[PDB]
Amino acid sequence: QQMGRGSMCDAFVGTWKLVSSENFDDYMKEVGVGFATRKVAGMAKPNMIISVNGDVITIKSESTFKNTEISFILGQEFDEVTADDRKVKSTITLDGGVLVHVQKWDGKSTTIKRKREDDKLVVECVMKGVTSTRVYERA
Numbered sequence: 178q179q180m181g182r183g184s185m186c187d188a189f190v191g192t193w194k195l196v197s198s199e200n201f202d203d204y205m206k207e208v209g210v211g212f213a214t215r216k217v218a219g220m221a222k223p224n225m226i227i228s229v230n231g232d233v234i235t236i237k238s239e240s241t242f243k244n245t246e247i248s249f250i251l252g253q254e255f256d257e258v259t260a261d262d263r264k265v266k267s268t269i270t271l272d273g274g275v276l277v278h279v280q281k282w283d284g285k286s287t288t289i290k291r292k293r294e295d296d297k298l299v300v301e302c303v304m305k306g307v308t309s310t311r312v313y314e315r316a
């Protein structure tokens with residue numbers, strides 16, 4: 178083994194905690210999440226952990242609601258069971274330094290974008306005309 182070099186996604190690596198969430202309930206409604214799930218998922222305050230190992234990116238989310246973990250290679254689709262229990266087909270790419278996560282299921286699609294803004298990691302969840310913004314800071 179030799180030690181690898183860095184990459185642009187290193188800006189994302191680390192441990193992040195949710196500090197603010199706007200219009201997430203409306204997002205979840207638009208996605209089709211049911212009442213009891215929305216209310217408990219909307220109350221969650223996740224720690225999000227992003228790591229890189231070679232070509233593989235891992236995103237872990239930990240909360241009192243659910244713990245999730247996905248591992249992927251940019252541009253390479255995978256199967257994902259989401260925290261709300263949708264079975265989706267997911268592809269995650271970089272677009273100009275934004276991590277773009279598209280989920281497809283049941284003829285529907287939603288996009289989750291992650292972007293660095295100052296010391297924060299901003300998450301933008303989009304379902305048709307409904308957007309939710311979630312802001313994370315370093316743990």
Ligand SMILES: CC(C)Cc1ccc([C@@H](C)C(=O)O)cc1
Nearest residue numbers: 205208210218223260261300311
């Ligand atoms: C319909 C919802 C429950 C799916 C969902 C949206 C956003 C996240 C992460 C990015 C988050 O910020 O918690 C996780 C799950």
